[PDB]
Amino acid sequence: MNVSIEEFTHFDFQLVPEPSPLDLVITESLKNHIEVNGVKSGALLPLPFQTGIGKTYTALNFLLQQMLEQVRSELKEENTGKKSKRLLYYVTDSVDNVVSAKADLLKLIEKQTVKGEPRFTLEQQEYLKAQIVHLPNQSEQLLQCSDAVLNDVLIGFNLNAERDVQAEWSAISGLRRHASNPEVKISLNRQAGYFYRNLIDRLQKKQKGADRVLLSGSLLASVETLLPGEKIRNGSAHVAFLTTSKFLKGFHNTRSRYSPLRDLSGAVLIIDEIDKQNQVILSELCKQQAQDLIWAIRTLRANFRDHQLESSPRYDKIEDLFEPLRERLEEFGTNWNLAFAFNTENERPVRLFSDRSFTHVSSATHKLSLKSDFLRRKNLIFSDLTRFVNEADVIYQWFLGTMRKAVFQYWENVRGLLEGTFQEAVQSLLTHFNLQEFESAVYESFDTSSSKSYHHTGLKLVEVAHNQGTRDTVNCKASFLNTSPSGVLADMVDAGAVILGISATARADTVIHNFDFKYLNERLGNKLLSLSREQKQRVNNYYHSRRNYKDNGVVLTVKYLNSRDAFLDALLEEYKPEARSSHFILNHYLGIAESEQAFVRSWLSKLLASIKAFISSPDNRYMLSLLNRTLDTTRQNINDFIQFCCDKWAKEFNVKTKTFFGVNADWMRLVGYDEISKHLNTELGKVVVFSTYASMGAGKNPDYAVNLALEGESLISVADVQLRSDIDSIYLEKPTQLLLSDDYSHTANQLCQFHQILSLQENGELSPKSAENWCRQQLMGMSRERSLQQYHQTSDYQSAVRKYIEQAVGRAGRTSLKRKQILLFVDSGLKEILAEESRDPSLFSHEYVALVNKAKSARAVRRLFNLAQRNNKDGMLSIKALVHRLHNQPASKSDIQEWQDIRTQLLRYPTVAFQPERFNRLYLQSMTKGYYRYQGNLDGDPNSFEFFDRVPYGDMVSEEDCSLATLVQNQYVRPWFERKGFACSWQKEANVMTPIMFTNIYKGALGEQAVEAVLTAFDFTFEEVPNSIYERFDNRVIFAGIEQPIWLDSKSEGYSSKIALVEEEFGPSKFIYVNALGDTSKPIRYLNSCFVETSPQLAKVIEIPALIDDTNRTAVQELIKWLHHS
Amino acid sequence: KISLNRQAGYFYRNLIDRLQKKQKGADRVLLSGSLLASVETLLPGEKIRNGSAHVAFLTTSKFLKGFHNTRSRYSPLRDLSGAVLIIDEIDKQNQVILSELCKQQAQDLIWAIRTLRANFRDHQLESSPRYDKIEDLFEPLRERLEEFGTNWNLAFAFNTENERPVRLFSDRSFTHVSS
Amino acid sequence: FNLQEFESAVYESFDTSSSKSYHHTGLKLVEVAHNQGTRDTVNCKASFLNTSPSGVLADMVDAGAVILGISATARADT
DNA sequence: TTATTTTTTTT
DNA sequence: TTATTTTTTTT
């Protein structure tokens, strides 16, 4: 039925079910959020609920409350008209869970009862179910649509008429009937996808124009079944279930591909298994295709010489946007001789990598130069460029940006006469400029100091390789990340989304396998919500109520298994008593090369020892083995030997054993997930399952139906709440390949690798030195095992390993019926890693706590030291670039202002209690408040600096080493500072300014402020040094209306060269060199240009040793006179 | 069958692409014995190219499009010297050849000339003895493009001033017609 | 020359008084129409026949082929 | 030295 | 006025 909202007119929105503790926790925290800025404000709420406490039930119940609240609102806001819908999403990585969760929500709508009566009437239940929509990938979306619906759509849009549609749809309409063959399914899926693209292309093509069919009734219902997004666009539906990858790619409606990230204002957005989404988003970012810069710039240069836009009022204003760009291209092409193609002079690849600050690296060891050989009309790359690449860039991006500005400019112009103008704008502009090749990149451009952080500046990777089929021309295929998955998540919050991250490990302290919650905490501030200690305690109590292991007498046994070589040798030679030796058997019968045999032994002995202990246990029947690797037919020899050992212990212990080799995910989906449960329901023998961590993260509730006739002796209810039971013994092989890697292409894999390296550097997990070596060796083709070397030395590796162990034993813990005794066999390598666990254990699973407590029964400092070097390195290379750009005569306004801003910040806030957002890495965090020690060469290598403890003797940055407290005692400077608000004394805070800032900027600026302070009261008037000589000197000065130019530098032939440079463009001038603080008794010196002493009438230059001892009023007076002698 | 046919065609293209790619370069597998027989069953043109077979049965449309061997798409029209060539139902082939000729795709001349004009201003070939003589072939063309672009103001795009199509037709002599 | 767009046309160029006849001079047809999604720019999409099927057949003979045209109406006067 | 199995969507 | 059903191969 087309049920109207009026069915809820008598519904009592106050009649909520009794809330479980988790619902209270969620409601409380969102209430707190609303208080702290929260109305019309985003949030992010990581929820580390353990699996089996009722995570999904809680989240779906929450989502249901949001639906009821929306309906309640719409019954009353009709006084305000129909507002924009408040969309609700549920996203997760895996399709199997999106569909499962949707079905659970519908089931909940069916059977939710309050005071023992069903909460919703049938028209109500149809109403709510109408609001929910589900958005699969295109191909499956097509295959869901019945033939009648799709034929109705084809008729309604008259697309029934044209041949290609009919042939294609006929073929697809056929294959459905024999899709029972999976092979048919594969072909059908691919073909259906292409059809869905073409079809929806034609629908929305007609819909944009006047050819649009007015949708209503049966045709509307047919389309809304074909295009579920149409229900959202027209407001029929407002709850959407979709995977993360669909969510990132957006989904079609009848007009255009609506993309949810662009429109999050007020959206509520439940993300299940939130930490897994870091990888999924990353896998989306790394798919970005490279653009050949050589081709791009030469094309732009060529086409922007003559090509003109028409002058008509249709787009009068646009062409002026391009004059700067056009001029830049001519300058650029003349500089680099873009007429000539490019070549190297060839077996090694040439690659460049850079984040966009301080971590620049190149493959070739020496400097890469690029010189035009006019005798060969070709630009050659030598080894003795990076500047050329950086400029071929920025011009390219500027082109895309100017394209954006011009397109919505054209939108303004035609609005003077709705998205339908977008495509005609882009094509009109590219056609006039004849730049039609770029149309793909132009479209993708729309979709793809200050707080500095990697997570929103990303990285840049450039590869130079010969074009296909040539030996004389190379391209520059630049690849980019503008952001990192944590940057995307923070942007989603800043656009106002409310995100709930339900995941048992949502706050794992890793930055590879989770978002960077240090960054998110910093950027979001108090929008990153968190569970108060009260709430965590309450959730812990509830968890104990649901899974009270202790009071019902469940015993958790943990043993750590070493390699036991003699044990393996005995069993192996029993498997082959006729053979020579055990290692012979590994080589001969098992196929293990002796290069691998030591490793395979250390592995297999632990596995077999765990198995034997399982078989000996009386009560246990269900052991799950989690290996890194799949024991399948490609390791069938090992399977046979393991089967032999199982048989031996089966006979010896007089218990039957069933072995499931090869339990990988496709086996689970296609063949045999259930009969492990069946075998538990029907037989007395024990079951051993061999599987992997990967094949269980994506996998069902690994449980079985209790057959009390077989197992009722060993099972207990552990809950105080169909009888089901779960895994009773687990073997946990140490997780191995923990670095992420992308299979999409070699380019995307490289982006994944560099993202991981830079993210580890971002946290201070790696010092900048280690991060550069790792980045470099990635350019030079690091082997995957040496990348794993580099990663294993971090502590982030420890946290990622503990994440997998915590998730593994959580997944096995769902049911509330347990054995008396649970056996946990852990690889001995995990003993130390688990021993290091130190987080608050209040939300852990009971199994994990057992693992930790058994292991223990036998780094912020490091992090802080590395971040000190990173902040110092970033300050030092950024100041070098900035100062060089000031000498890049003339200085831009922005550089000038940023220089004064840095100086003002350092003067006002030499220390701060919290690292400020806007100047986050002028400062470094000290282990000692107010001052710290460092050692390093400020002209030297930034990677070599060492700090607080590791340099007990070295330089010190402190209030005392800048003589500030001496300085402010002067009766002239102190009013000046206190008017300016500069800190006359350093607050003893943790965050202190970095050494490069201290030596280069702060002392210099402090001296300049002091000299201006004293001299101003003697009528010296100071003005900003003109932009044609900026910071070549400190201040241009006017005393008492004396007309000749005056110049200050504050603390000989080169300095004479600056002097001559000044007097070339302001004529004869007076130069004053003064140290603000020092010994005022020393003599004033009157100097020539070459700093040689001469008469005051000849002295263009004066050197003053000290103004402050006490004011050196004397030196002021002879300075006044020395000007008088002009 | 319909889906299988289309899919098999695309696979055959990609596959033979990779075979003859390797065969052109030093990566070429030396064909002999069972591998040769297997390829010659996959690529029947290989029997002709290496002289195993010399009688070919094929439709006119295949004959016009040529057929692959292990190295390149041999096209029979280019190599007819001494070929004997039985055509059955010869008069029907007029239509079939015509249907092949009419498939020729149009080239946008405005885009083509503006692209040529733009790129042939500065762009130079390298002077090395690898291809010493070539660049002199282009000086007349380059000069013509500059003359042409100046004559017709190719900087400016083109427009009419719109409901009727504008079409021109000409054989290349005396039967010129315009819409 | 940075003319990489033309690579398709360059490849197809290899494959595709005096005695005057249509059959080997062919025809030329040019259509001028607005580019997709614009109202201010037109293209000139030229189409060509260099020859006619009788011209192709005569070229095949001139390259030395020996052709047997078995057909019950091989010399229909059309 | 370290030692694998994995998802999703679109062209 | 004239008044339909058709093949083949490749991208």
Short mmCIF file of all heavy atoms in Angstrom, two decimals, chain E:
data_model
loop_
_atom_site.label_atom_id
_atom_site.label_comp_id
_atom_site.label_asym_id
_atom_site.label_seq_id
_atom_site.Cartn_x
_atom_site.Cartn_y
_atom_site.Cartn_z
P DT E 1 1.20 8.95 -57.23
OP1 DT E 1 0.29 8.25 -56.30
OP2 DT E 1 1.42 10.41 -57.09
"O5'" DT E 1 2.62 8.24 -57.16
"C5'" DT E 1 3.66 8.62 -58.04
"C4'" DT E 1 4.99 8.03 -57.60
"O4'" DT E 1 5.35 8.56 -56.31
"C3'" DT E 1 4.99 6.51 -57.44
"O3'" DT E 1 6.20 5.97 -57.93
"C2'" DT E 1 4.88 6.33 -55.94
"C1'" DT E 1 5.70 7.50 -55.46
N1 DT E 1 5.43 7.90 -54.08
C2 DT E 1 6.45 8.45 -53.36
O2 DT E 1 7.56 8.63 -53.82
N3 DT E 1 6.13 8.79 -52.08
C4 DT E 1 4.91 8.64 -51.47
O4 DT E 1 4.71 8.98 -50.31
C5 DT E 1 3.88 8.05 -52.28
C7 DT E 1 2.51 7.84 -51.72
C6 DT E 1 4.19 7.71 -53.54
P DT E 2 6.31 4.41 -58.24
OP1 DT E 2 7.42 4.19 -59.18
OP2 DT E 2 4.97 3.93 -58.60
"O5'" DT E 2 6.69 3.77 -56.83
"C5'" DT E 2 7.84 4.21 -56.15
"C4'" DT E 2 8.03 3.42 -54.87
"O4'" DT E 2 7.19 3.97 -53.83
"C3'" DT E 2 7.67 1.94 -54.96
"O3'" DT E 2 8.62 1.16 -54.27
"C2'" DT E 2 6.32 1.88 -54.29
"C1'" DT E 2 6.48 2.93 -53.22
N1 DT E 2 5.18 3.45 -52.76
C2 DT E 2 4.95 3.57 -51.42
O2 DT E 2 5.77 3.31 -50.57
N3 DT E 2 3.71 4.04 -51.10
C4 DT E 2 2.70 4.38 -51.98
O4 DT E 2 1.61 4.79 -51.60
C5 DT E 2 3.01 4.21 -53.37
C7 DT E 2 2.00 4.54 -54.42
C6 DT E 2 4.22 3.75 -53.69
P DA E 3 8.48 -0.44 -54.25
OP1 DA E 3 9.82 -1.01 -54.11
OP2 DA E 3 7.63 -0.86 -55.37
"O5'" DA E 3 7.75 -0.73 -52.88
"C5'" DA E 3 8.31 -0.27 -51.69
"C4'" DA E 3 7.41 -0.56 -50.52
"O4'" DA E 3 6.28 0.32 -50.55
"C3'" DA E 3 6.83 -1.97 -50.51
"O3'" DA E 3 7.29 -2.66 -49.40
"C2'" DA E 3 5.32 -1.76 -50.42
"C1'" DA E 3 5.22 -0.34 -49.93
N9 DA E 3 3.98 0.31 -50.29
C8 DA E 3 3.10 0.92 -49.45
N7 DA E 3 2.06 1.43 -50.04
C5 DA E 3 2.26 1.12 -51.37
C6 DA E 3 1.50 1.38 -52.52
N6 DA E 3 0.35 2.04 -52.50
N1 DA E 3 1.98 0.95 -53.70
C2 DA E 3 3.14 0.29 -53.71
N3 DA E 3 3.94 -0.01 -52.70
C4 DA E 3 3.43 0.43 -51.54
P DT E 4 6.93 -4.21 -49.26
OP1 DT E 4 6.60 -4.73 -50.60
OP2 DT E 4 5.94 -4.35 -48.18
"O5'" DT E 4 8.29 -4.86 -48.82
"C5'" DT E 4 8.88 -4.47 -47.64
"C4'" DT E 4 9.69 -5.61 -47.12
"O4'" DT E 4 11.05 -5.48 -47.59
"C3'" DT E 4 9.76 -5.72 -45.62
"O3'" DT E 4 9.65 -7.08 -45.29
"C2'" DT E 4 11.12 -5.14 -45.29
"C1'" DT E 4 11.93 -5.50 -46.51
N1 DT E 4 13.02 -4.55 -46.80
C2 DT E 4 13.92 -4.86 -47.78
O2 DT E 4 13.88 -5.88 -48.41
N3 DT E 4 14.88 -3.92 -47.98
C4 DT E 4 15.02 -2.72 -47.32
O4 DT E 4 15.92 -1.94 -47.58
C5 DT E 4 14.04 -2.45 -46.31
C7 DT E 4 14.10 -1.18 -45.53
C6 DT E 4 13.10 -3.37 -46.10
P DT E 5 9.80 -7.64 -43.80
OP1 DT E 5 8.65 -8.54 -43.62
OP2 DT E 5 10.11 -6.60 -42.81
"O5'" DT E 5 11.04 -8.60 -43.96
"C5'" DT E 5 11.06 -9.46 -45.06
"C4'" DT E 5 12.44 -9.97 -45.32
"O4'" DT E 5 13.26 -8.91 -45.83
"C3'" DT E 5 13.15 -10.50 -44.08
"O3'" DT E 5 13.60 -11.81 -44.33
"C2'" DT E 5 14.29 -9.50 -43.87
"C1'" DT E 5 14.53 -9.02 -45.27
N1 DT E 5 15.17 -7.73 -45.34
C2 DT E 5 16.01 -7.47 -46.38
O2 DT E 5 16.25 -8.27 -47.26
N3 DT E 5 16.57 -6.23 -46.36
C4 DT E 5 16.38 -5.26 -45.42
O4 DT E 5 16.93 -4.18 -45.49
C5 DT E 5 15.49 -5.60 -44.36
C7 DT E 5 15.20 -4.61 -43.28
C6 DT E 5 14.93 -6.80 -44.37
P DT E 6 14.77 -12.47 -43.47
OP1 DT E 6 14.66 -13.92 -43.67
OP2 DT E 6 14.75 -11.96 -42.09
"O5'" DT E 6 16.08 -12.02 -44.24
"C5'" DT E 6 17.30 -12.10 -43.62
"C4'" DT E 6 18.35 -11.46 -44.49
"O4'" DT E 6 17.91 -10.15 -44.84
"C3'" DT E 6 19.68 -11.27 -43.80
"O3'" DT E 6 20.50 -12.35 -44.09
"C2'" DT E 6 20.23 -10.03 -44.49
"C1'" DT E 6 18.99 -9.26 -44.88
N1 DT E 6 18.72 -8.17 -43.98
C2 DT E 6 19.30 -6.97 -44.21
O2 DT E 6 20.05 -6.76 -45.14
N3 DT E 6 18.98 -6.00 -43.31
C4 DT E 6 18.15 -6.13 -42.22
O4 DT E 6 17.92 -5.20 -41.46
C5 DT E 6 17.57 -7.43 -42.04
C7 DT E 6 16.65 -7.69 -40.89
C6 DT E 6 17.89 -8.37 -42.91
P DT E 7 20.31 -13.76 -43.37
OP1 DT E 7 19.31 -14.49 -44.14
OP2 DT E 7 20.18 -13.55 -41.92
"O5'" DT E 7 21.68 -14.49 -43.66
"C5'" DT E 7 22.80 -14.11 -42.95
"C4'" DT E 7 23.77 -13.34 -43.80
"O4'" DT E 7 23.19 -12.08 -44.16
"C3'" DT E 7 25.04 -13.00 -43.07
"O3'" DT E 7 25.96 -13.97 -43.37
"C2'" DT E 7 25.45 -11.66 -43.64
"C1'" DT E 7 24.15 -11.06 -44.14
N1 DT E 7 23.63 -9.99 -43.31
C2 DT E 7 23.90 -8.71 -43.65
O2 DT E 7 24.57 -8.40 -44.59
N3 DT E 7 23.34 -7.78 -42.83
C4 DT E 7 22.56 -8.01 -41.73
O4 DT E 7 22.11 -7.11 -41.04
C5 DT E 7 22.31 -9.38 -41.43
C7 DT E 7 21.47 -9.75 -40.26
C6 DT E 7 22.85 -10.30 -42.23
P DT E 8 26.56 -14.86 -42.21
OP1 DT E 8 26.65 -16.23 -42.69
OP2 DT E 8 25.81 -14.57 -40.98
"O5'" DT E 8 28.00 -14.25 -42.05
"C5'" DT E 8 28.69 -13.90 -43.18
"C4'" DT E 8 29.64 -12.79 -42.89
"O4'" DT E 8 28.91 -11.60 -42.75
"C3'" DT E 8 30.37 -12.94 -41.60
"O3'" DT E 8 31.60 -13.47 -41.86
"C2'" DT E 8 30.50 -11.51 -41.07
"C1'" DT E 8 29.67 -10.69 -42.04
N1 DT E 8 28.74 -9.81 -41.39
C2 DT E 8 28.80 -8.48 -41.65
O2 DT E 8 29.63 -7.97 -42.37
N3 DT E 8 27.86 -7.74 -41.02
C4 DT E 8 26.87 -8.21 -40.20
O4 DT E 8 26.06 -7.47 -39.67
C5 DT E 8 26.86 -9.61 -39.99
C7 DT E 8 25.83 -10.23 -39.10
C6 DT E 8 27.78 -10.34 -40.60
P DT E 9 32.43 -14.17 -40.71
OP1 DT E 9 33.40 -15.03 -41.37
OP2 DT E 9 31.49 -14.72 -39.74
"O5'" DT E 9 33.21 -12.98 -40.05
"C5'" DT E 9 34.16 -12.34 -40.79
"C4'" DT E 9 34.50 -11.02 -40.17
"O4'" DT E 9 33.32 -10.23 -40.10
"C3'" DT E 9 35.02 -11.10 -38.76
"O3'" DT E 9 36.35 -10.77 -38.77
"C2'" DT E 9 34.21 -10.07 -37.98
"C1'" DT E 9 33.47 -9.33 -39.07
N1 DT E 9 32.16 -8.93 -38.67
C2 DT E 9 31.76 -7.66 -38.88
O2 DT E 9 32.47 -6.82 -39.37
N3 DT E 9 30.49 -7.39 -38.48
C4 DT E 9 29.61 -8.26 -37.92
O4 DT E 9 28.48 -7.93 -37.60
C5 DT E 9 30.09 -9.59 -37.74
C7 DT E 9 29.21 -10.63 -37.13
C6 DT E 9 31.33 -9.86 -38.12
P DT E 10 37.23 -11.04 -37.47
OP1 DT E 10 38.58 -11.35 -37.93
OP2 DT E 10 36.47 -11.94 -36.60
"O5'" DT E 10 37.31 -9.63 -36.79
"C5'" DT E 10 38.10 -8.66 -37.38
"C4'" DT E 10 37.81 -7.33 -36.76
"O4'" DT E 10 36.41 -7.07 -36.85
"C3'" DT E 10 38.17 -7.24 -35.29
"O3'" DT E 10 39.11 -6.24 -35.11
"C2'" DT E 10 36.85 -6.90 -34.60
"C1'" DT E 10 36.01 -6.37 -35.73
N1 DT E 10 34.61 -6.64 -35.55
C2 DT E 10 33.71 -5.69 -35.91
O2 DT E 10 34.03 -4.63 -36.37
N3 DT E 10 32.42 -6.04 -35.71
C4 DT E 10 31.95 -7.22 -35.20
O4 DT E 10 30.76 -7.45 -35.05
C5 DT E 10 32.96 -8.17 -34.84
C7 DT E 10 32.57 -9.49 -34.28
C6 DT E 10 34.23 -7.84 -35.04
P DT E 11 40.09 -6.32 -33.86
OP1 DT E 11 41.46 -6.12 -34.36
OP2 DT E 11 39.75 -7.55 -33.13
"O5'" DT E 11 39.66 -5.07 -32.98
"C5'" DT E 11 39.65 -3.78 -33.57
"C4'" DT E 11 38.59 -2.92 -32.93
"O4'" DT E 11 37.31 -3.52 -33.12
"C3'" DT E 11 38.73 -2.73 -31.43
"O3'" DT E 11 39.31 -1.46 -31.15
"C2'" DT E 11 37.29 -2.84 -30.90
"C1'" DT E 11 36.46 -2.97 -32.17
N1 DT E 11 35.28 -3.84 -32.03
C2 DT E 11 34.05 -3.35 -32.37
O2 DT E 11 33.88 -2.23 -32.79
N3 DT E 11 33.02 -4.23 -32.20
C4 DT E 11 33.10 -5.52 -31.74
O4 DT E 11 32.11 -6.23 -31.63
C5 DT E 11 34.41 -5.98 -31.40
C7 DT E 11 34.61 -7.37 -30.89
C6 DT E 11 35.44 -5.13 -31.56
#
